[PDB]
Amino acid sequence: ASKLRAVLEKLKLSRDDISTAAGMVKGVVDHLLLRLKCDSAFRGVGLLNTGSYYEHVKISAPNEFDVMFKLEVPRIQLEEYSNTRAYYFVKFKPLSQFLEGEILSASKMLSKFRKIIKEEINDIKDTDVIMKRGGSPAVTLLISEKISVDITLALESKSSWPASTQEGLRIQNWLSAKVRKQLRLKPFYLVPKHAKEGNGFQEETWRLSFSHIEKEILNNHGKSKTCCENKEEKCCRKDCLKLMKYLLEQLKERFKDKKHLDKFSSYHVKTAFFHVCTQNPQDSQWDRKDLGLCFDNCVTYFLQCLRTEKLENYFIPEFNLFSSNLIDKRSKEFLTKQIEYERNNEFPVFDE
Ligand SMILES: Nc1nc(=O)c2ncn([C@@H]3O[C@@H]4COP(=O)(O)O[C@H]5[C@@H](O)[C@H](n6cnc7c(N)ncnc76)O[C@@H]5COP(=O)(O)O[C@@H]3[C@@H]4O)c2[nH]1
Ligand SMILES: [Zn+2]
C-alpha cells in the first residue's frame, strides 16, 4: 500500500508535462475541425467529449492522446456483420458519395477523412506534424516528433442501442437501474474499425463505440452521488485504474526486447476495471485506506481474464477482447505468468 501510494505520487510529478502536451493536441484538433467542416461530407463534424483535458483529449498512455470526431448522421439502419455483435454494416432509412449499393463504405469515408487531415498537415508551417498499426479506425498524428494523437471518425446515431448491447452495461447494482436507463438513451457511435474477413478486412463494416459512456462512468463512479465530493467519501477507484494501467505499461517496457506484450492495451485494463466495479458495487469496497486490497482485487480479476482467455467488452458481452482471434494463446499465457509473479512478490516492477 505504501509502495502503491509512492507510485501514485511519482505519477503526479508529470502532471504539468501531460498538461502542456494536451494543449498542443488541443490546438491542432481545432484547426482540423474547421477544415473538415468546409467539406460537404463533414460539416456536421464536431468533437466528442471523451477525455480529461478540456473535454476532447483523452490520455491512453504517456504521450499517447486520443480524440474522437463525431458526425451527426441521418437516421441509420444497422445490419450486424455475420454474428460478431460488435461490427455492423451501415445503411440509410450528402454522404451519398461513400455508398456502395446501399451500404455506407467505412473504408471510403475513412479514406477522405484521412485525406483532408493530410492536406491540413502539409499546409501548416506552425509545427512539425506527420502521419502514420493495422485495422485501426484512427488516423494518428505525431506532434513535435514526441506527441502521438489518434484521431477517430465516429458516426453518431441517436436511436436505441443495438440488440448486442441489451445485456451489457451491467451497472444496475452499482450505479443503479435509473442511471443505466439514462445512459442507454444517449447516442452510440460507430467507428470505421473493420471486422476481420479471413485474411483481410470487411472494409465496409463499422464497430460500436461507447467512449462517451466510458468517460461518464469513470468520472461519476460511486454508488453515492457524492462519492469523492467530500473528505468522508474518498474512494480509490480511479487510483486503482491508474495503477493497473501503469502496471501494464511497465511490463510492456520491460518485455520490449521480444515484444511479447504488444497486443495488450490500456483498453483491456479499463474494461477489466469496469467489471470489477460491477463485482464490487459498494463504495465501502473502495475505501482509500484499502488501496492495497482494492488493487489486488483488480489484479486478480485481470489474471482470471487472462487465464480463461475471456475479457468481455463492457457494453457488448458476447464480444470477447481476449479471444484467440484477437490475441494469441501464447501471449495471454505469457502475461499471466508475469502478473502472477508480480502479484506473488509485492510488485517488484514498482520498486525504487
Ligand atoms: N484510438 C482508437 N479508438 C478505437 O476505438 C480503436 N479500436 C481499435 N483501435 C486500435 O486498432 C488496432 C486493432 O485493435 P482491435 O480493434 O482488433 O482490438 C481493440 C479494440 O477491440 C478495443 N478497443 C480499443 N479502443 C476501443 C474503444 N474506444 N471502444 C471499443 N473498443 C476499443 O481494444 C483492442 C485493442 O486496442 P489498441 O491496441 O489499444 O489499438 C487498437 C489496435 O491498434 C482503436 N484505437
Ligand atoms: Zn469516488
Curated annotation (Swiss-Prot):
Residues modified as Phosphotyrosine: 54
Annotated segments matching region DNA-binding: 12-54, 215-238
Chain positions covered by the region annotation Interaction with collided ribosomes: 172-213
Outcome, altering residue 30 to A: Abolished poly-ADP-ribosylation by PARP1, stimulating interferon production
Residues that bind 2',3'-cGAMP: 66, 150, 193, 207
Residues joined by cross-link Glycyl lysine isopeptide (Lys-Gly) (interchain with G-Cter in ubiquitin): 12, 118, 178, 215, 242, 245, 258-259, 310
Record's comment on post-translational modification: The N-terminal disordered part (1-160) is phosphorylated by AURKB during the G2-M transition, blocking CGAS liquid phase separation and preventing activation. Phosphorylation at Tyr-54 by BLK promotes cytosolic retention. Localizes into the nucleus following dephosphorylation at Tyr-54. Phosphorylation at Ser-266 activates the nucleotidyltransferase activity. Dephosphorylation at Ser-266 by PPP6C impairs its ability to bind GTP, thereby inactivating it. Ubiquitinated at Lys-245 via 'Lys-48'-linked polyubiquitin chains, leading to its SQSTM1-mediated autophagic degradation. Interaction with TRIM14 promotes recruitment of USP14, leading to deubiquitinate Lys-245 and stabilize CGAS. Ubiquitinated at Lys-12 and Lys-215 by RNF185 via 'Lys-27'-linked polyubiquitination, promoting CGAS cyclic GMP-AMP synthase activity. Monoubiquitination at Lys-178 by TRIM56 promotes oligomerization and subsequent activation. Monoubiquitination by TRIM41 promotes CGAS activation.
BP GO annotations: activation of innate immune response; cAMP-mediated signaling; cellular response to exogenous dsRNA; cGAS/STING signaling pathway; cGMP-mediated signaling; cytoplasmic pattern recognition receptor signaling pathway; defense response to virus; determination of adult lifespan
List of residues that carry 5-glutamyl polyglutamate: 119
Result after altering residue 134 to E: Found in patients with tumors; dominant mutation; reduced nucleotidyltransferase activity
UniProt effect for mutating residue 85 to E: Does not affect interaction with nucleosomes
Topology in membrane: Peripheral membrane protein
Site, Important for preferential detection of curved long DNA: residue positions: 26, 34
Outcome of mutating residue 34 to R: Induces alteration of the DNA-binding surface and leads to increased synthesis of cyclic GMP-AMP (cGAMP)
Outcome (variant: residue 227 to A): Abolishes DNA binding and enzyme activity
N6-methyllysine modified-residue sites: 337
Gene Ontology MF terms in the entry: 2',3'-cyclic GMP-AMP synthase activity; ATP binding; chromatin binding; DNA binding; double-stranded DNA binding; GTP binding; metal ion binding; molecular condensate scaffold activity
Role, per record: Nucleotidyltransferase that catalyzes the formation of cyclic GMP-AMP (2',3'-cGAMP) from ATP and GTP and plays a key role in innate immunity. Catalysis involves both the formation of a 2',5' phosphodiester linkage at the GpA step and the formation of a 3',5' phosphodiester linkage at the ApG step, producing c[G(2',5')pA(3',5')p].
Extra remark beyond the main annotation: The cGAS-STING signaling pathway drives sterile inflammation leading to type I interferon immunopathology in severe COVID-19 disease caused by SARS-CoV-2 virus infection. Tissue damages in the lung and skin lesions are caused by activation of the cGAS-STING signaling leading to aberrant inflammation. Endothelial cell damage is also caused by activation of the cGAS-STING pathway: SARS-CoV-2 infection triggers mitochondrial DNA release into the cytosol.
Family: Belongs to the mab-21 family.
Name the record gives this protein: Cyclic GMP-AMP synthase
